[PDB]
Symmetry: C2
Subunit: 70 residues, 2 copies
């Protein structure tokens, strides 16, 4: 009967891991303030990506469950 | 036939921007090698997130098309 495919998405980091990452420092290096400001945006985007996927999964569930009554 | 729209989510960066970003240097900054290796994972994750979202959006559009044509009662 009905057969679903299965796809897997592999991620390297979590927002938490980015929040908790401590870079080593050296004689010359990237401006800590500038890197921090940039990663702040990255962490926000990880949260937003996660939320949008959750929203899209819920929308998927909504549509599938409607079709349950077809 | 009638439609409404929303703008639910706000993003700050693209993967391309993270690949291309050039940081100012200074005394006692973060290890460039360490930061670059870290951001490489971020870049790959942005691409994967983006792919997953676009795949779900395509799937949902297929399902809405199916539902448009489906009798329920
Ligand atoms: Ni079968």
């Amino acid at each position: 009967g009905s057969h679903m495919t299965s796809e897997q998405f592999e991620y390297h980091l979590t927002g938490k891991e980015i929040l908790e990452k401590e870079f080593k420092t050296g004689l010359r290096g990237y401006s800590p303030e500038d890197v921090d400001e940039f990663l702040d945006m990255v962490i926000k985007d990880y949260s937003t990506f996660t939320q949008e996927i959750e929203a899209l999964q819920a929308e998927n569930i909504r549509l599938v469950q409607e079709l349950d009554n077809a």
